[PDB]
Amino acid sequence: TLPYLDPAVPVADRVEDLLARMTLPEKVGQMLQLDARDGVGPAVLEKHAGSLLHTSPENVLAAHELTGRTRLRIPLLLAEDCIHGHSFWVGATIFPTQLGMAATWDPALVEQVAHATAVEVAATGVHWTFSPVLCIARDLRWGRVDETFGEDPFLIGELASAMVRGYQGDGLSDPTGILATAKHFAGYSETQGGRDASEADISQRKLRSWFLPPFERVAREGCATFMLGYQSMDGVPVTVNGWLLDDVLRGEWGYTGTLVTDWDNVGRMVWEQHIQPDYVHASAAAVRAGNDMVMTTPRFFEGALEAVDRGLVEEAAIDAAVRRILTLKFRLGLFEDPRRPDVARQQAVIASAEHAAVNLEVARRSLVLLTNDGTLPFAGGLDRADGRALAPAGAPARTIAVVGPNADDDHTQLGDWAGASGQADWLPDGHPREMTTTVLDGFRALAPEGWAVTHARGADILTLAPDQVVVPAAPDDALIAEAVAAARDADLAVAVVGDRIELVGEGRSTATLELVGGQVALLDALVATGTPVVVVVVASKPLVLPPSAHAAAAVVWAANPGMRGGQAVAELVLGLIEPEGRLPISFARHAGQQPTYYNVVRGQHGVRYADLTQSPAFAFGEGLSYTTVEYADLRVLGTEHGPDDVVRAEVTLTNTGSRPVRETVQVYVSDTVTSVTWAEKELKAYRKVDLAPGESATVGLEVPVADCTLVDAHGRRVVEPGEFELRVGPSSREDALLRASFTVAG
Amino acid sequence: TLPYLDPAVPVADRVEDLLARMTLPEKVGQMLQLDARDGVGPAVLEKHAGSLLHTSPENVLAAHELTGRTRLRIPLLLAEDCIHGHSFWVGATIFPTQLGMAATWDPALVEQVAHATAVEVAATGVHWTFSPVLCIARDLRWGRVDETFGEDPFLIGELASAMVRGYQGDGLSDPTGILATAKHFAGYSETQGGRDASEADISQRKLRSWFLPPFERVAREGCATFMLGYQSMDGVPVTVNGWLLDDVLRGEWGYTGTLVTDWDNVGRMVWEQHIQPDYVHASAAAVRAGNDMVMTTPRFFEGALEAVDRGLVEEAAIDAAVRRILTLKFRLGLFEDPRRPDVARQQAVIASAEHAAVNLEVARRSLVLLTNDGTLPFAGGLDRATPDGRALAPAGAPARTIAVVGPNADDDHTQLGDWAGASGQADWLPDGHPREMTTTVLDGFRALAPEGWAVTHARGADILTLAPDPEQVVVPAAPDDALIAEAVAAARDADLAVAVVGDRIELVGEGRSTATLELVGGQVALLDALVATGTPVVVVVVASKPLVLPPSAHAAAAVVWAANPGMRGGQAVAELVLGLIEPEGRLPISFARHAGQQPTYYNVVRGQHGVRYADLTQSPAFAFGEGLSYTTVEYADLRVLGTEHGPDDVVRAEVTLTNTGSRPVRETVQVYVSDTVTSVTWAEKELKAYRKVDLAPGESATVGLEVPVADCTLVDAHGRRVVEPGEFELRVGPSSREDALLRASFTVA
Numbered sequence A: 001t002l003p004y005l006d007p008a009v010p011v012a013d014r015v016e017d018l019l020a021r022m023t024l025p026e027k028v029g030q031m032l033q034l035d036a037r038d039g040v041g042p043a044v045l046e047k048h049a050g051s052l053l054h055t056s057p058e059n060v061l062a063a064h065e066l067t068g069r070t071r072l073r074i075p076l077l078l079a080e081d082c083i084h085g086h087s088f089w090v091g092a093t094i095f096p097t098q099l100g101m102a103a104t105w106d107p108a109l110v111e112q113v114a115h116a117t118a119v120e121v122a123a124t125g126v127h128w129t130f131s132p133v134l135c136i137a138r139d140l141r142w143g144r145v146d147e148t149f150g151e152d153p154f155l156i157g158e159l160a161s162a163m164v165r166g167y168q169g170d171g172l173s174d175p176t177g178i179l180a181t182a183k184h185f186a187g188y189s190e191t192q193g194g195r196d197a198s199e200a201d202i203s204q205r206k207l208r209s210w211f212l213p214p215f216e217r218v219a220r221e222g223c224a225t226f227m228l229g230y231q232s233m234d235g236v237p238v239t240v241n242g243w244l245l246d247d248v249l250r251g252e253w254g255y256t257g258t259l260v261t262d263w264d265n266v267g268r269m270v271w272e273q274h275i276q277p278d279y280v281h282a283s284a285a286a287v288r289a290g291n292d293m294v295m296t297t298p299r300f301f302e303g304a305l306e307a308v309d310r311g312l313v314e315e316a317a318i319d320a321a322v323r324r325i326l327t328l329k330f331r332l333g334l335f336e337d338p339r340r341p342d343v344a345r346q347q348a349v350i351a352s353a354e355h356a357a358v359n360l361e362v363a364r365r366s367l368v369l370l371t372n373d374g375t376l377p378f379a380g381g382l383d384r385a386d387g388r389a390l391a392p393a394g395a396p397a398r399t400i401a402v403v404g405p406n407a408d409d410d411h412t413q414l415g416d417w418a419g420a421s422g423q424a425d426w427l428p429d430g431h432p433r434e435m436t437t438t439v440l441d442g443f444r445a446l447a448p449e450g451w452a453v454t455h456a457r458g459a460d461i462l463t464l465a466p467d468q469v470v471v472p473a474a475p476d477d478a479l480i481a482e483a484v485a486a487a488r489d490a491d492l493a494v495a496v497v498g499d500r501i502e503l504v505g506e507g508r509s510t511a512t513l514e515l516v517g518g519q520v521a522l523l524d525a526l527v528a529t530g531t532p533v534v535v536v537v538v539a540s541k542p543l544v545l546p547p548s549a550h551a552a553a554a555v556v557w558a559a560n561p562g563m564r565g566g567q568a569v570a571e572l573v574l575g576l577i578e579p580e581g582r583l584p585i586s587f588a589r590h591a592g593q594q595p596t597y598y599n600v601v602r603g604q605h606g607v608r609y610a611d612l613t614q615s616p617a618f619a620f621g622e623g624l625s626y627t628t629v630e631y632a633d634l635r636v637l638g639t640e641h642g643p644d645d646v647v648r649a650e651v652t653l654t655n656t657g658s659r660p661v662r663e664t665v666q667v668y669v670s671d672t673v674t675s676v677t678w679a680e681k682e683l684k685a686y687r688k689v690d691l692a693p694g695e696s697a698t699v700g701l702e703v704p705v706a707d708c709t710l711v712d713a714h715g716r717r718v719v720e721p722g723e724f725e726l727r728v729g730p731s732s733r734e735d736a737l738l739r740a741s742f743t744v745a746g
Numbered sequence B: 001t002l003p004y005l006d007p008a009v010p011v012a013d014r015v016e017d018l019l020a021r022m023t024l025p026e027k028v029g030q031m032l033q034l035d036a037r038d039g040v041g042p043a044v045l046e047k048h049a050g051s052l053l054h055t056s057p058e059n060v061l062a063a064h065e066l067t068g069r070t071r072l073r074i075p076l077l078l079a080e081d082c083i084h085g086h087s088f089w090v091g092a093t094i095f096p097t098q099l100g101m102a103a104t105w106d107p108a109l110v111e112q113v114a115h116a117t118a119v120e121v122a123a124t125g126v127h128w129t130f131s132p133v134l135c136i137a138r139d140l141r142w143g144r145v146d147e148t149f150g151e152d153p154f155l156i157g158e159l160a161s162a163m164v165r166g167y168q169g170d171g172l173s174d175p176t177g178i179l180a181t182a183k184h185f186a187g188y189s190e191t192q193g194g195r196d197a198s199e200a201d202i203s204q205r206k207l208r209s210w211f212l213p214p215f216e217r218v219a220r221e222g223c224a225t226f227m228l229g230y231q232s233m234d235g236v237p238v239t240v241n242g243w244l245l246d247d248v249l250r251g252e253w254g255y256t257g258t259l260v261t262d263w264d265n266v267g268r269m270v271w272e273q274h275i276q277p278d279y280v281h282a283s284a285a286a287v288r289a290g291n292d293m294v295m296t297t298p299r300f301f302e303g304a305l306e307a308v309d310r311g312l313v314e315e316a317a318i319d320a321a322v323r324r325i326l327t328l329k330f331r332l333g334l335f336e337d338p339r340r341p342d343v344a345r346q347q348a349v350i351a352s353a354e355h356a357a358v359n360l361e362v363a364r365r366s367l368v369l370l371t372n373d374g375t376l377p378f379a380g381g382l383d384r385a386t387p388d389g390r391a392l393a394p395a396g397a398p399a400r401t402i403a404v405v406g407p408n409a410d411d412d413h414t415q416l417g418d419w420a421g422a423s424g425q426a427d428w429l430p431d432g433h434p435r436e437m438t439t440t441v442l443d444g445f446r447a448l449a450p451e452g453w454a455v456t457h458a459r460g461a462d463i464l465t466l467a468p469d470p471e472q473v474v475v476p477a478a479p480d481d482a483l484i485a486e487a488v489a490a491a492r493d494a495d496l497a498v499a500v501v502g503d504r505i506e507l508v509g510e511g512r513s514t515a516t517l518e519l520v521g522g523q524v525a526l527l528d529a530l531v532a533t534g535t536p537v538v539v540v541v542v543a544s545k546p547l548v549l550p551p552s553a554h555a556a557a558a559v560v561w562a563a564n565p566g567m568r569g570g571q572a573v574a575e576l577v578l579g580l581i582e583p584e585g586r587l588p589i590s591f592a593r594h595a596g597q598q599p600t601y602y603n604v605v606r607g608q609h610g611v612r613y614a615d616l617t618q619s620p621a622f623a624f625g626e627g628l629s630y631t632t633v634e635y636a637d638l639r640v641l642g643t644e645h646g647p648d649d650v651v652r653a654e655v656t657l658t659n660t661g662s663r664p665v666r667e668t669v670q671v672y673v674s675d676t677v678t679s680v681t682w683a684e685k686e687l688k689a690y691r692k693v694d695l696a697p698g699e700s701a702t703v704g705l706e707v708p709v710a711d712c713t714l715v716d717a718h719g720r721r722v723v724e725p726g727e728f729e730l731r732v733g734p735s736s737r738e739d740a741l742l743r744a745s746f747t748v749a
């Protein structure tokens, strides 16, 4: 012999050949992507699926052998959520969540993570990861903030671009490359009340301004697939949104990649949005809008059939989709080699030592030290003789009390979309305990031999009940008394607090942003012992911390740091490493304070709620080191530019302290007068700079003029001639930014 | 002639004769509305202003004398904020705020308030009120929620239409009529963060869905002027927003009234929104967009003169604006009668007996009883001997002590709310209105309590002080142990504790949004302590807007929402607590449990994955429409009388109500429409009609309901309001709570 089974015939012909031998039930199924957990058998055979997701290792094998038993035997596309590591492979390297990786501000490192993940993923016979996420964290209430790279469009585009580069490798012929997905196109992250897939009150211009830039960048860099979001946007769900799918994605951007809906997007139009009366119309509408893959809407099988029967859609539309789908499978060589799982390769690469080393580096670089009264690094800092630290001169016997509900919780440390977070029914126990170092484990392994590490759960967070729902745990006096006694008997109290899976993720938005359960009572009682308290926040997203946390000696943000996270936290507290992370997201002081992202649009009357500052608790870009860096002399080198030039500048940094630092210099551009209202400033560039104690460096900086854009009326992204301001410094706080003027002429 | 002074000459000819004699500075000046507080001399003489606002009484007489000294002697328009009464006339009738009056759900009553206000205003020489407010209260953080009629487009249209009818009376010839203003067109109440005039991230469809309907109503009913909002909307401030001004207001609606900007809109485009490099270009854009009156941007005078000289705008665009302004003045007859203030007329009508009686009725009907474990009406309820005097001690309660506590229990300024007296916007009333005209909660209990009862008072908490910014700043007061202990001691020696809690002016209004919605200062500690005494506590909320109440308030005996009830509000609360009146009010707005719970307005758009926040219910603390009486009312037989209707038809229906208790009630029956399946995502339900029913104890009544099919619309994609054929549910009950609502379906083919 047949022509579609001939690797000498071009793709287009083998497509048309194969299409000609397919029924209409087999063409409809070729768009289908079904849940493998409801039976691989009926999905490959009765329905004629083109793809499977959520496929356990046994079902992966079973699917390949059910393919030999179909009539034409089209190779399946096997897709999995490999969100920060091979999420659901029992012994895989699990990395920090995307939010924790964003704090490294290190795209070369994030490339390495995506590549490491791809090597592990390809070994298990999965071709397609639903990753990276390009949503922008603009409402902290949203449950899925942990899955974003934060609140800046530019940083998100940098890190997601690096993820796509790493996953896909060299192309459709790389053995260890996989298909990436630009995920939740577009606007899914800012919906009413921060709720999951409520209405997005987002106009075309608002979408173009803060949501589309990351997607457009990966779209022109070769991201293989895009995934359509759940949410209705200005009344119209993305699945049937011709403006976004056609005029933008296919039209303005010229994107030739493949589209997959989100889970039951077609069905939800019936029973949840109530914009379709039945599954035949719903199927029909999704066909007209230009969908390729329909994810987990089984009724789309008979729905799209009943709909071509009753003439609601022609057969020639189904063909257009099946054409782009089979084109992809043919371009991967899947009819030649279906990329079966190779057990020998699994044993060679999965959880390899060099993957663990990548994971440790991200962990170490992602921790953000937020406050520090000088208690850290503990006891002045430690050296090693890896290996155990030596006790410092004059600190022979110290006790570190590690307390709080997240101190030894390795499930919460891995976060959502990993292990037993719930989307895979084949890991009820999650990942092997030995692969994860909790905060407790980290101090126990690295403390000097004359030191002691004690442990006390000090608070619970919650229990489940029916009204199903989270019941916050009361403060529990015996539990707190025990943690207090441990702190009263120690030199340092390390309180590990945060959230956990029932307060994170899909359907689990939160309204208060506060520590649920006994944690606030715990923190109050720990701080009142007078033992210095380091608050380590292991949580999916930024939380409102209580006053006692701002009275504590130090605060470390760890954002679900993954499998080596506890090692990094212990190294940071002991001074075995220097802090390097910077916030990719602002921390609100109160849920009502929002919006707290740094790029707020000008215009407000006043600067202040009558009852509350508008200053965020912690701002985008901020983070401490163990030294002090002085910023001085920002000079724009030639202040006049045309629309294709580059703004070049210099700033001088001085390490005026006693320890080395890797500083992250941040470059913001402010457009002084704009035709339409615009952000007060936007991040456009950054540079990491290594500085030895006492070393001073003059640093070259650099922003393309073609990036100093806004979206005007009509909706064009243009550079507008006028005065500009360059703002350079260690964070987004205005009292930390040097500034210098420049101008763009026509 | 001169023909412009000839009332025999048709108006358009008089306009055109006067326009032709005007210099360019005189024409630009006619577009200025200047702040009379800054000096009435330069405004009228040097700047040739067409209008003044915030004009003190001595400045009103001065303004007329100055007009006689100008070249053209064009009579001024004197405009004022008369927002719930003549706000800034030292002894005028101050009614409840708009949020207070909305709880009455009574447009005929609201029309009488506006009429009474208009009679008082017109006696003082003011021609034009910047009222009513049509904004929709959709973010409770917003500082101006008290200026709205709540969160429902339909109720806002009803009451805003009543205000416009009352103010304007018989029209331009009516001596007690005044111009109304449809204020903050449009989208000003839902901006980022609930902040004052941040970005409104409002698309065209959303603006049409929830914000435009009440503006469209009063525009076709003849509202004389529209005020353009501060805020930038999808990048473009209303002031220069061609889609809103031309395509909608003057295109689709054919609106022919006069436009006025909000305060310094034009200049704000330079120094605040940063969309204009200088005032010349800001003035030019404002003229190009089609503005008429430019409020309090005095630099518009030079800027527009430079803009014409440099050729940025054509002089004929100025002429167009001056034509519309002059036409209004001619049609009002200001060139024949400029409507001088009248001292004899002031004495006749201001703070009159019949105006205080309208005030009393609004106040009584506005209180909302939200919770009640049976403690109310206190001691079983009282009677009067004398529909005015003290109540008599009832059977079984000869001696009772009432302890009136709380920061707002005796504070006349807070009870009147923003936009009244000493609220800040007028500088000639330093002590506000005369103390004796306002009955505080305390005053009311002291006047109504039977002879053998005693009324005590303890301030129990402070709310705030002011301080300089930790770079003018609200500093929440600490809980004060002595002051708490004094209110605790008063409560322990009492039968009932009436805790009057809320906010005050520094936590309310322009530039004064709130993030937490909680009671500020020592109020929470005071409530905790009071509830723990064992004496039953009635929590009375005198505040501008719905506050999140602490747990102790939900454990108290009863909770009463009063929303700044005006000068008689304390009489009303005392009467309510004593059972001298029945509760009638119903919430025009929902109460959130936490700022992070929003949105909590009843008409939320479908689509959410899940029902609740993982840490918190989405159920509001109190919902749109609810409110208790002192009796019980059953809703029984909801029946749609014929379920087939077409585009011109009327859905009719019956429901049966029974007063199964021992006490009379005026119940507010509420009618909601749900569009079961829509082409676009839409609200789960919307209020479309309501009706008040009187019921004596034991009485039943079958009640007829009608909703025009032409109101069961949605805004589709393409953005156009249409009834979509299909299935609908009719939901009828005493509130917007789904478990209080009978339902019946019907079809619109």
Ligand SMILES: OC[C@H]1O[C@@H](O)[C@H](O)[C@@H](O)[C@@H]1O
Pocket: A053, A081, A130, A262, A263, A423, A506
């Ligand atoms: O499992 C496949 C998909 O399930 C969905 O419900 C989530 O929104 C996506 O994040 C995910 O890729």
Ligand SMILES: OC[C@H]1O[C@@H](O)[C@H](O)[C@@H](O)[C@@H]1O
Pocket: B053, B081, B130, B183, B262, B263, B425, B510
């Ligand atoms: O005072 C006149 C006007 O300017 C501003 O202070 C307010 O936004 C308006 O509501 C008011 O009508």
Ligand SMILES: [Ca+2]
Pocket: A671, A672, A673, A674, A675, A720, A721, A722, A723
């Ligand atoms: Ca500019």
Ligand SMILES: [Ca+2]
Pocket: B675, B676, B677, B678, B724, B725, B726, B727, B728
């Ligand atoms: Ca319908």
